[PDB]
Amino acid sequence: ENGIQLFSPTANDVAVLSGYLIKSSLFSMPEGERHITLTLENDWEGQAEHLTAKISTGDHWLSLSVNPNRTNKNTIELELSSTDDPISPPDNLDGMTFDIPVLKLGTTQKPMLPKITGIEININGNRSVRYASDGGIEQTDTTSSPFGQSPSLGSGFNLVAPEWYGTENATLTMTPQWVGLPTSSFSTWYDKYNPKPASNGVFKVQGYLVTSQKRDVLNDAKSQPLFDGTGAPQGQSLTFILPAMHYPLTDSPSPNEWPASVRIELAEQDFMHAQYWQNPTDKNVPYTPQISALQIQFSTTAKPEQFTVYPLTPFGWANTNEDPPSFTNDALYLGFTNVLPGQTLSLYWQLE
Amino acid sequence: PVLKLGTTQKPMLPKITGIEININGNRSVRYASDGGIEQTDTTSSPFGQSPSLGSGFNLVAPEWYGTENATLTMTPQWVGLPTSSFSTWYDKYNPKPASNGVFKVQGYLVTSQKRDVLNDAKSQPLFDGTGAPQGQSLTFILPAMHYPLTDSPSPNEWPASVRIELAEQDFMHAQYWQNPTDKNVPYTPQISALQIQFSTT
């Protein structure tokens, strides 16, 4: 009611942030520990603590813990914990409304950041993975038998996740927590079976991309060993590379109903359940694969057409490939709502 | 919640500097084995009907979340134990399990990211005594558990859970099935109730 002195300090003096607004569809990131790596065009030397990175989640600005190491001098690493709110496209978040989430990154009183040119995505966590074997649908966080109680060649399970849809040339990593493994080598355990399975690792798996039209072979038809080691078998991770997966998202819990899914199958040698039933004497009980949990890690790289960068201005963002206006003088802004172009703006100032 | 404490017409209380918390009772503990979810106040088989190495169950409780360096105590009420030592009962099994207590357990903190080993990877004996086996309590120390609270009955869906697993020696169900003669039926761990006690500072 008393008015305000022009260009005078107030209680809400917000420092001007200079940076970029990144708009990408790969920032869905439902839950888990989330890592985002940004590749800048030029080597940038600056303080890590001076940065300010926030992600849009509905109507909230969630902060990101910047990596203080700042190694390689050319990338920025942002982390999100599993406790954090799931990331959602912004909706009336300080004015902007976008169909996919945005990343706001900028700094102040220091050399500016170069334009962002590459985005890398890494997630670990199985809490949003649809997993189901031939027997049915089982939770990846509970006990399950991935290959059934009597596995044979071609038996296996299927997986799908909303994050994988829309990506290309991605990487998927799986680590199963085995339970009830023999205390000795499988060759020692399967001593009397013919042929005797020496050199633990003969159990191989294959990855398939299953659609309603056809099946495709992943990892160039190579097979990976489930177990390794000369002594007792040791569980090891499994890695697959997915092709361009551009399919609509569904909500069916079973991955089979999805238009595309990832299927893992036994490849070379069975655990000899048929042999044991053939001659059930002088042999140990054949090992039935049992899993208590299955850890899932996902990684992908953003293509140039999957993200957009906007330069930052004190009250908005400029268009792409446009240099933001430079600050040389103090500026005052006025806004009018219900006026039309070509009309006359008539104002009265009361000043001293 | 707040605590109101005071007195009158007497010397005043000094300022409170430390709080210790102790609860006993399993009526608010989510307990589930590999087979499924069972009530801790009813009959259950903690390690299933055919236990092996690594088999076990999981537990969680809202009181444990938000604490740090806490203490958890469990006392299972065993049923159908042999009237003699397990060495006597498992006389013909090779190797013969002398010195009852070879059945050991391990505690894990299970999250969606990884598993962590509790009690510095030590193992505790389920039973003790030279005669008939005697049930004994099990103690674990938990790390800083700062996770949000959920409502799912199954402890697996929770962000963090406490998992107990068999460590050293099985009850020899595989040996019995391989040569089922001149041997007694192997003991299947059965529990009528499981008492739970919690402590923290």
Coordinates of C-alpha atoms in Angstrom, one line a residue:
Chain A
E1 CA 0.0 0.0 0.0
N2 CA 3.0 2.3 0.5
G3 CA 4.4 1.5 -2.9
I4 CA 7.9 0.3 -3.7
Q5 CA 11.1 2.3 -4.5
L6 CA 12.2 1.4 -8.0
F7 CA 15.1 -1.1 -8.1
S8 CA 15.3 -1.4 -4.4
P9 CA 16.2 -4.5 -2.4
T10 CA 13.3 -6.6 -1.2
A11 CA 12.7 -9.8 0.8
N12 CA 12.5 -12.1 -2.3
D13 CA 15.6 -11.0 -4.3
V14 CA 16.2 -14.2 -6.3
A15 CA 19.6 -14.4 -7.9
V16 CA 19.5 -14.8 -11.7
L17 CA 20.2 -18.3 -12.9
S18 CA 22.0 -18.8 -16.2
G19 CA 21.7 -22.3 -17.8
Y20 CA 19.6 -24.5 -19.9
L21 CA 16.2 -26.2 -19.8
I22 CA 16.3 -29.8 -21.1
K23 CA 13.2 -31.4 -22.5
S24 CA 13.3 -35.1 -23.1
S25 CA 11.0 -38.1 -23.0
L26 CA 13.5 -40.5 -21.4
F27 CA 13.2 -38.7 -18.0
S28 CA 10.1 -40.8 -16.9
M29 CA 12.1 -42.7 -14.3
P30 CA 9.4 -44.3 -12.1
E31 CA 11.4 -45.4 -9.1
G32 CA 14.7 -46.7 -7.8
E33 CA 18.2 -45.1 -7.9
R34 CA 18.3 -42.9 -10.9
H35 CA 21.5 -41.5 -12.6
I36 CA 21.6 -38.9 -15.4
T37 CA 24.8 -38.0 -17.2
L38 CA 25.0 -34.8 -19.3
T39 CA 27.7 -34.4 -22.0
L40 CA 28.6 -30.8 -22.8
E41 CA 30.1 -29.7 -26.1
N42 CA 33.0 -27.9 -24.4
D43 CA 35.2 -28.7 -21.4
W44 CA 33.9 -26.6 -18.5
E45 CA 35.9 -25.8 -15.5
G46 CA 33.8 -24.7 -12.5
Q47 CA 32.6 -25.4 -9.0
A48 CA 30.3 -28.3 -8.6
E49 CA 28.5 -26.8 -5.6
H50 CA 27.6 -23.7 -7.6
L51 CA 25.3 -25.7 -9.9
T52 CA 21.5 -26.0 -9.3
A53 CA 19.7 -28.9 -11.0
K54 CA 16.0 -29.6 -10.5
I55 CA 13.7 -32.1 -12.1
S56 CA 10.0 -31.5 -12.9
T57 CA 7.6 -33.9 -11.1
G58 CA 4.0 -32.8 -11.5
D59 CA 3.9 -29.5 -9.6
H60 CA 7.1 -30.0 -7.6
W61 CA 10.8 -29.2 -8.2
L62 CA 12.8 -32.1 -6.9
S63 CA 16.5 -31.3 -6.3
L64 CA 19.3 -33.6 -7.5
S65 CA 22.5 -34.4 -5.7
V66 CA 25.3 -33.3 -8.1
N67 CA 28.3 -35.5 -8.1
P68 CA 31.1 -33.5 -6.3
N69 CA 34.0 -35.3 -8.0
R70 CA 33.3 -33.6 -11.3
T71 CA 35.8 -35.9 -13.1
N72 CA 36.6 -35.8 -16.8
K73 CA 35.8 -32.1 -16.7
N74 CA 33.3 -32.5 -19.5
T75 CA 30.2 -34.3 -17.9
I76 CA 27.7 -33.5 -15.1
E77 CA 26.4 -36.4 -13.1
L78 CA 23.0 -36.2 -11.3
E79 CA 21.7 -38.8 -8.9
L80 CA 18.2 -39.6 -7.5
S81 CA 17.4 -41.9 -4.6
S82 CA 14.7 -44.5 -4.4
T83 CA 13.0 -42.5 -1.7
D84 CA 12.4 -39.6 -4.1
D85 CA 9.0 -38.9 -5.7
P86 CA 8.5 -40.5 -9.1
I87 CA 9.3 -38.1 -12.0
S88 CA 6.2 -36.9 -13.9
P89 CA 5.7 -34.4 -16.8
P90 CA 5.2 -30.9 -15.5
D91 CA 1.7 -29.6 -15.0
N92 CA 1.3 -25.8 -14.1
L93 CA 4.8 -26.0 -12.5
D94 CA 5.7 -22.3 -12.4
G95 CA 3.9 -21.7 -15.7
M96 CA 5.2 -24.4 -17.9
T97 CA 3.1 -27.4 -19.1
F98 CA 4.9 -30.2 -21.0
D99 CA 3.9 -33.7 -22.1
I100 CA 7.3 -35.1 -20.8
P101 CA 9.4 -34.1 -17.8
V102 CA 12.0 -31.3 -18.0
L103 CA 15.4 -30.7 -16.4
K104 CA 16.4 -27.3 -15.2
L105 CA 20.1 -26.8 -14.8
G106 CA 22.0 -23.5 -14.3
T107 CA 24.5 -21.6 -12.2
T108 CA 25.4 -18.0 -11.3
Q109 CA 28.4 -15.6 -10.8
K110 CA 30.7 -18.0 -12.7
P111 CA 31.6 -19.1 -16.2
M112 CA 28.6 -20.3 -18.1
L113 CA 27.8 -24.0 -19.0
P114 CA 28.3 -25.1 -22.6
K115 CA 25.3 -26.4 -24.4
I116 CA 24.2 -29.9 -23.5
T117 CA 24.8 -32.4 -26.3
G118 CA 24.4 -35.9 -24.9
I119 CA 22.3 -37.5 -22.2
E120 CA 23.0 -40.9 -20.6
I121 CA 20.5 -42.8 -18.5
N122 CA 21.1 -45.5 -15.8
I123 CA 18.6 -47.1 -13.4
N124 CA 19.0 -49.9 -11.0
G125 CA 16.0 -51.5 -9.3
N126 CA 13.4 -54.2 -10.1
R127 CA 10.4 -52.7 -8.4
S128 CA 8.9 -51.7 -11.8
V129 CA 9.7 -54.7 -13.9
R130 CA 7.0 -57.2 -15.1
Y131 CA 8.4 -60.7 -14.6
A132 CA 6.6 -63.9 -15.4
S133 CA 7.8 -67.4 -16.2
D134 CA 5.8 -70.2 -18.0
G135 CA 4.2 -71.3 -14.7
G136 CA 2.7 -67.8 -14.1
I137 CA 3.5 -64.3 -12.8
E138 CA 5.9 -64.0 -9.9
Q139 CA 7.3 -61.0 -8.0
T140 CA 10.9 -60.4 -8.7
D141 CA 11.4 -59.4 -5.0
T142 CA 10.1 -62.8 -3.7
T143 CA 11.1 -66.4 -4.0
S144 CA 10.5 -67.9 -7.4
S145 CA 11.7 -70.6 -9.8
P146 CA 12.6 -68.9 -13.1
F147 CA 12.8 -72.1 -15.2
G148 CA 10.0 -74.1 -13.5
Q149 CA 10.3 -77.3 -11.4
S150 CA 11.3 -79.4 -14.4
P151 CA 13.2 -77.2 -16.9
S152 CA 14.0 -78.3 -20.4
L153 CA 15.6 -76.7 -23.5
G154 CA 13.7 -73.6 -24.5
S155 CA 12.1 -73.1 -21.0
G156 CA 12.4 -69.6 -19.5
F157 CA 10.7 -66.4 -18.5
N158 CA 9.7 -63.0 -19.9
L159 CA 10.3 -59.5 -18.8
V160 CA 9.1 -56.0 -19.7
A161 CA 9.3 -52.5 -18.3
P162 CA 7.8 -49.1 -19.3
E163 CA 11.3 -47.5 -19.3
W164 CA 12.5 -49.8 -22.0
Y165 CA 9.8 -48.7 -24.5
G166 CA 10.8 -45.8 -26.7
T167 CA 14.5 -46.5 -26.3
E168 CA 17.1 -47.8 -28.8
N169 CA 20.4 -49.7 -28.5
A170 CA 19.9 -49.9 -24.7
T171 CA 21.6 -52.2 -22.2
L172 CA 19.9 -54.5 -19.7
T173 CA 21.6 -56.2 -16.8
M174 CA 20.2 -58.9 -14.6
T175 CA 21.6 -60.4 -11.4
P176 CA 19.8 -63.4 -9.9
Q177 CA 20.2 -64.3 -6.2
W178 CA 20.6 -68.0 -6.3
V179 CA 19.6 -70.2 -3.3
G180 CA 20.4 -73.8 -2.5
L181 CA 23.5 -74.1 -4.7
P182 CA 25.6 -77.2 -4.3
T183 CA 28.7 -76.8 -2.0
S184 CA 30.8 -78.4 -4.8
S185 CA 31.1 -78.1 -8.5
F186 CA 28.3 -79.2 -10.8
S187 CA 30.7 -81.8 -12.3
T188 CA 31.2 -83.2 -8.8
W189 CA 27.4 -83.1 -8.0
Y190 CA 26.5 -84.5 -11.4
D191 CA 29.2 -87.1 -11.3
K192 CA 27.3 -90.2 -12.5
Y193 CA 25.2 -88.5 -15.1
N194 CA 26.1 -89.2 -18.7
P195 CA 27.6 -87.0 -20.2
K196 CA 29.3 -85.6 -17.1
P197 CA 29.0 -81.7 -17.1
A198 CA 32.5 -80.6 -16.5
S199 CA 33.6 -76.9 -16.6
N200 CA 30.6 -75.3 -14.8
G201 CA 29.1 -72.8 -17.3
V202 CA 27.7 -75.3 -19.8
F203 CA 24.3 -74.0 -18.8
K204 CA 23.7 -71.2 -21.3
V205 CA 20.8 -68.8 -21.9
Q206 CA 19.5 -66.9 -24.9
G207 CA 17.7 -63.6 -25.2
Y208 CA 14.7 -63.0 -27.5
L209 CA 12.5 -60.0 -28.3
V210 CA 9.0 -61.5 -28.6
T211 CA 6.3 -59.7 -30.5
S212 CA 2.9 -61.0 -31.7
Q213 CA 4.3 -61.1 -35.3
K214 CA 7.7 -62.9 -34.8
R215 CA 10.6 -63.5 -32.5
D216 CA 14.0 -61.9 -32.8
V217 CA 17.4 -63.0 -31.5
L218 CA 19.3 -60.7 -29.2
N219 CA 23.0 -60.3 -28.5
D220 CA 23.8 -61.7 -32.0
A221 CA 22.7 -65.2 -31.0
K222 CA 25.5 -65.5 -28.4
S223 CA 24.9 -67.5 -25.2
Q224 CA 25.9 -66.5 -21.7
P225 CA 26.8 -68.8 -18.8
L226 CA 24.5 -68.8 -15.8
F227 CA 27.3 -69.8 -13.4
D228 CA 31.0 -69.5 -13.3
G229 CA 33.9 -70.8 -11.2
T230 CA 35.7 -74.1 -10.8
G231 CA 34.6 -74.7 -7.3
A232 CA 31.0 -74.2 -6.1
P233 CA 28.9 -72.5 -8.8
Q234 CA 28.9 -68.7 -8.6
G235 CA 26.1 -66.6 -9.9
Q236 CA 27.0 -63.9 -12.5
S237 CA 25.2 -61.1 -14.2
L238 CA 23.6 -61.3 -17.6
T239 CA 23.7 -58.5 -20.2
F240 CA 21.6 -57.9 -23.3
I241 CA 21.3 -55.2 -26.0
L242 CA 17.9 -54.3 -27.2
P243 CA 16.9 -52.9 -30.6
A244 CA 14.7 -49.9 -31.4
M245 CA 11.6 -50.6 -29.2
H246 CA 8.9 -48.1 -30.3
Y247 CA 5.7 -49.6 -29.0
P248 CA 2.7 -48.2 -27.1
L249 CA 2.6 -48.6 -23.3
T250 CA 0.1 -51.0 -21.7
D251 CA -0.9 -51.8 -18.1
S252 CA -1.2 -55.6 -18.1
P253 CA 0.9 -57.1 -15.4
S254 CA 1.8 -60.1 -17.5
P255 CA 4.6 -59.2 -20.0
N256 CA 3.2 -61.5 -22.6
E257 CA 0.2 -59.2 -23.3
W258 CA 2.6 -56.4 -24.0
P259 CA 3.4 -55.8 -27.7
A260 CA 7.1 -56.5 -27.1
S261 CA 8.8 -58.3 -24.3
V262 CA 12.2 -59.8 -23.4
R263 CA 12.4 -63.6 -23.2
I264 CA 15.2 -65.6 -21.7
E265 CA 15.5 -69.3 -22.5
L266 CA 17.9 -72.1 -21.7
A267 CA 20.2 -72.8 -24.6
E268 CA 22.7 -75.7 -24.5
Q269 CA 22.3 -78.2 -21.6
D270 CA 19.5 -79.1 -19.2
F271 CA 20.0 -79.7 -15.5
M272 CA 19.4 -83.5 -16.3
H273 CA 15.9 -84.0 -14.8
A274 CA 15.0 -86.4 -17.6
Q275 CA 18.2 -88.4 -16.9
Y276 CA 17.5 -88.6 -13.2
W277 CA 13.9 -89.8 -13.8
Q278 CA 15.3 -92.3 -16.3
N279 CA 17.7 -94.0 -13.9
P280 CA 16.9 -92.7 -10.3
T281 CA 19.7 -94.6 -8.5
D282 CA 23.3 -93.7 -7.5
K283 CA 22.6 -90.0 -8.4
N284 CA 22.0 -86.9 -6.4
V285 CA 18.8 -84.9 -6.7
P286 CA 19.2 -82.7 -9.8
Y287 CA 19.4 -79.0 -9.0
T288 CA 16.3 -77.0 -9.6
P289 CA 17.0 -73.3 -10.2
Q290 CA 15.5 -71.2 -7.4
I291 CA 15.7 -67.4 -7.1
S292 CA 15.1 -65.3 -3.9
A293 CA 15.4 -62.0 -5.8
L294 CA 16.5 -60.7 -9.2
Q295 CA 18.3 -57.3 -9.4
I296 CA 17.7 -55.4 -12.6
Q297 CA 19.8 -52.5 -14.0
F298 CA 19.0 -50.5 -17.1
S299 CA 21.1 -48.2 -19.2
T300 CA 20.6 -46.2 -22.5
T301 CA 21.9 -43.2 -24.4
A302 CA 19.7 -40.4 -25.8
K303 CA 19.7 -39.9 -29.6
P304 CA 19.9 -36.3 -30.8
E305 CA 16.2 -36.3 -31.7
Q306 CA 15.1 -37.4 -28.2
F307 CA 15.9 -34.2 -26.3
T308 CA 15.7 -30.5 -26.7
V309 CA 17.7 -27.7 -25.0
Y310 CA 16.5 -24.1 -24.3
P311 CA 18.7 -21.3 -23.1
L312 CA 17.7 -19.6 -19.8
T313 CA 16.5 -16.1 -19.3
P314 CA 15.6 -14.3 -16.0
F315 CA 11.8 -15.1 -16.4
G316 CA 11.7 -17.8 -19.0
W317 CA 13.5 -19.6 -21.8
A318 CA 14.4 -18.5 -25.3
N319 CA 13.9 -20.7 -28.4
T320 CA 16.5 -23.3 -29.5
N321 CA 19.6 -22.1 -31.3
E322 CA 19.0 -18.6 -30.1
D323 CA 21.4 -16.5 -28.0
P324 CA 19.6 -15.2 -24.9
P325 CA 19.6 -11.4 -24.5
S326 CA 22.6 -10.0 -22.6
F327 CA 22.2 -8.1 -19.4
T328 CA 23.8 -4.6 -19.6
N329 CA 21.2 -2.4 -18.0
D330 CA 18.5 -2.8 -15.4
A331 CA 15.1 -3.8 -16.8
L332 CA 11.5 -3.3 -15.7
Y333 CA 8.6 -5.4 -17.0
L334 CA 4.9 -4.8 -17.3
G335 CA 2.2 -7.3 -18.2
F336 CA -1.3 -7.0 -19.6
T337 CA -3.8 -9.8 -19.9
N338 CA -7.1 -8.9 -21.7
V339 CA -5.7 -6.5 -24.3
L340 CA -5.5 -7.1 -28.0
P341 CA -2.9 -6.1 -30.5
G342 CA -3.7 -2.8 -32.2
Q343 CA -5.4 -1.4 -29.1
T344 CA -4.2 1.6 -27.0
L345 CA -2.5 1.1 -23.7
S346 CA -3.4 4.1 -21.4
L347 CA -1.7 4.3 -18.0
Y348 CA -1.2 6.8 -15.2
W349 CA 1.9 6.8 -13.0
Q350 CA 2.0 8.2 -9.5
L351 CA 5.6 8.9 -8.7
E352 CA 7.9 11.0 -6.6
Chain B
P1 CA 3.8 -38.1 20.0
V2 CA 4.9 -36.1 23.1
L3 CA 5.7 -37.2 26.7
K4 CA 4.8 -35.0 29.6
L5 CA 6.7 -35.6 32.8
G6 CA 6.8 -33.4 36.0
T7 CA 6.4 -33.3 39.7
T8 CA 5.6 -30.8 42.5
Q9 CA 6.6 -29.7 46.0
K10 CA 10.0 -31.4 45.6
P11 CA 13.4 -30.9 44.0
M12 CA 13.2 -30.5 40.3
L13 CA 14.1 -33.1 37.7
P14 CA 17.3 -32.5 35.7
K15 CA 17.1 -32.1 32.0
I16 CA 16.5 -35.3 30.1
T17 CA 19.5 -36.2 28.0
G18 CA 18.9 -39.8 26.7
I19 CA 16.0 -42.0 25.8
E20 CA 16.0 -45.8 25.5
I21 CA 13.1 -47.7 24.0
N22 CA 12.1 -51.3 24.5
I23 CA 9.1 -53.2 23.1
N24 CA 8.2 -56.9 23.2
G25 CA 5.4 -58.4 21.3
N26 CA 4.9 -59.8 17.8
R27 CA 1.4 -58.6 17.1
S28 CA 2.6 -55.9 14.7
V29 CA 5.4 -57.7 12.8
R30 CA 5.1 -58.6 9.2
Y31 CA 6.4 -62.2 8.8
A32 CA 6.6 -64.2 5.6
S33 CA 8.6 -67.2 4.4
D34 CA 9.4 -68.3 0.8
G35 CA 6.1 -70.2 0.7
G36 CA 4.0 -67.2 1.6
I37 CA 2.7 -65.0 4.4
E38 CA 2.0 -66.6 7.7
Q39 CA 0.9 -65.2 11.0
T40 CA 3.5 -65.2 13.7
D41 CA 0.9 -66.1 16.3
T42 CA -0.1 -69.3 14.5
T43 CA 1.6 -72.5 13.4
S44 CA 4.1 -72.1 10.6
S45 CA 7.1 -73.6 9.0
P46 CA 9.8 -70.9 8.9
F47 CA 12.1 -72.7 6.5
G48 CA 9.5 -74.6 4.4
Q49 CA 8.8 -78.3 4.2
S50 CA 12.2 -79.1 2.4
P51 CA 14.7 -76.5 3.6
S52 CA 18.1 -76.1 2.0
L53 CA 21.1 -73.7 2.3
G54 CA 19.9 -70.1 1.8
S55 CA 16.2 -70.8 2.6
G56 CA 14.5 -68.6 5.2
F57 CA 12.0 -65.9 5.9
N58 CA 11.7 -62.1 6.0
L59 CA 10.5 -59.7 8.6
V60 CA 9.7 -56.0 8.9
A61 CA 8.0 -53.7 11.4
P62 CA 7.1 -50.0 11.3
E63 CA 8.8 -49.4 14.6
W64 CA 12.2 -50.4 13.1
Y65 CA 12.1 -47.7 10.4
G66 CA 13.7 -44.5 11.3
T67 CA 16.0 -46.0 14.0
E68 CA 19.7 -46.7 14.0
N69 CA 22.0 -49.2 15.7
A70 CA 18.9 -51.0 17.1
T71 CA 18.6 -54.5 18.6
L72 CA 16.2 -57.2 17.5
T73 CA 15.5 -60.3 19.5
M74 CA 13.5 -63.4 18.3
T75 CA 12.4 -66.4 20.2
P76 CA 10.8 -69.3 18.2
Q77 CA 8.5 -71.8 20.0
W78 CA 9.6 -75.1 18.5
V79 CA 7.3 -78.0 18.2
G80 CA 7.9 -81.7 17.6
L81 CA 11.6 -81.7 18.6
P82 CA 13.3 -85.1 19.0
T83 CA 13.6 -86.4 22.6
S84 CA 17.3 -87.1 22.0
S85 CA 20.2 -85.2 20.5
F86 CA 20.2 -84.5 16.8
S87 CA 23.4 -86.5 16.6
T88 CA 21.5 -89.5 18.0
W89 CA 18.5 -88.8 15.8
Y90 CA 20.7 -88.3 12.7
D91 CA 22.9 -91.3 13.6
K92 CA 23.3 -92.9 10.2
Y93 CA 23.5 -89.8 8.1
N94 CA 27.0 -89.0 6.6
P95 CA 28.5 -86.8 8.0
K96 CA 26.9 -87.3 11.4
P97 CA 25.9 -84.0 13.0
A98 CA 27.5 -84.0 16.4
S99 CA 27.5 -81.1 18.8
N100 CA 23.9 -79.8 18.3
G101 CA 24.2 -76.2 17.1
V102 CA 25.7 -76.8 13.6
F103 CA 22.5 -75.4 12.2
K104 CA 23.4 -71.8 11.8
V105 CA 21.5 -68.7 10.5
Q106 CA 22.5 -65.4 8.9
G107 CA 20.7 -62.0 8.9
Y108 CA 20.4 -59.8 5.9
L109 CA 19.0 -56.3 5.2
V110 CA 17.3 -56.7 1.8
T111 CA 16.6 -53.7 -0.3
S112 CA 15.7 -53.3 -4.0
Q113 CA 19.4 -52.3 -4.7
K114 CA 21.5 -54.8 -2.8
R115 CA 21.7 -57.1 0.2
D116 CA 23.7 -56.3 3.3
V117 CA 25.1 -58.7 5.9
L118 CA 24.1 -58.1 9.5
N119 CA 26.0 -59.0 12.7
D120 CA 29.3 -58.8 10.9
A121 CA 28.7 -62.0 9.0
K122 CA 28.5 -64.1 12.1
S123 CA 26.2 -67.1 12.5
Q124 CA 24.0 -68.1 15.4
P125 CA 23.0 -71.6 16.4
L126 CA 19.2 -72.4 16.3
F127 CA 19.5 -75.0 19.0
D128 CA 21.8 -75.7 22.0
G129 CA 22.4 -78.4 24.6
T130 CA 24.0 -81.8 24.6
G131 CA 20.7 -83.7 25.2
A132 CA 17.5 -82.9 23.4
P133 CA 17.8 -79.7 21.4
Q134 CA 16.8 -76.5 23.2
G135 CA 15.5 -73.5 21.4
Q136 CA 17.4 -70.2 22.0
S137 CA 16.9 -66.6 21.1
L138 CA 18.5 -64.9 18.1
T139 CA 19.9 -61.3 18.2
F140 CA 20.7 -58.9 15.4
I141 CA 21.9 -55.3 15.1
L142 CA 20.4 -53.2 12.4
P143 CA 22.0 -50.3 10.5
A144 CA 20.5 -46.8 9.9
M145 CA 17.1 -47.7 8.4
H146 CA 15.7 -44.4 7.1
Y147 CA 12.9 -45.5 4.7
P148 CA 9.3 -44.5 4.1
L149 CA 6.5 -46.5 5.6
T150 CA 4.2 -48.7 3.5
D151 CA 1.1 -50.8 4.3
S152 CA 1.8 -54.0 2.2
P153 CA 1.4 -57.1 4.5
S154 CA 4.3 -58.8 2.7
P155 CA 7.7 -57.6 4.0
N156 CA 9.2 -58.1 0.6
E157 CA 7.3 -55.1 -0.9
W158 CA 8.7 -52.9 1.8
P159 CA 11.8 -50.8 0.8
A160 CA 13.9 -52.6 3.5
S161 CA 13.3 -55.9 5.2
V162 CA 15.2 -58.3 7.6
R163 CA 15.9 -61.7 6.1
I164 CA 17.0 -64.8 8.0
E165 CA 18.7 -67.6 6.1
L166 CA 20.2 -71.0 6.9
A167 CA 24.0 -70.8 6.9
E168 CA 26.0 -74.0 7.4
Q169 CA 24.2 -77.3 7.5
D170 CA 20.9 -78.6 6.2
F171 CA 18.6 -80.9 8.1
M172 CA 19.6 -83.6 5.6
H173 CA 16.4 -83.9 3.5
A174 CA 18.4 -84.6 0.4
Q175 CA 20.4 -87.4 2.0
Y176 CA 17.2 -89.0 3.4
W177 CA 15.6 -88.9 -0.1
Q178 CA 18.7 -90.4 -1.7
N179 CA 18.9 -93.4 0.6
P180 CA 15.6 -93.7 2.5
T181 CA 16.4 -96.7 4.6
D182 CA 17.8 -97.3 8.1
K183 CA 17.2 -93.6 8.8
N184 CA 14.6 -91.6 10.8
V185 CA 12.5 -89.0 9.2
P186 CA 14.5 -85.8 9.0
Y187 CA 13.3 -83.0 11.2
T188 CA 11.2 -80.3 9.5
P189 CA 11.4 -77.0 11.5
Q190 CA 7.9 -76.2 12.7
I191 CA 6.9 -73.1 14.8
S192 CA 3.8 -72.5 16.8
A193 CA 4.6 -68.9 17.8
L194 CA 7.5 -66.5 17.4
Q195 CA 8.2 -63.9 20.2
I196 CA 9.7 -60.6 19.0
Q197 CA 11.5 -58.0 21.2
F198 CA 12.9 -54.7 20.0
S199 CA 15.2 -52.2 21.6
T200 CA 16.9 -48.9 20.5
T201 CA 18.5 -45.8 21.8

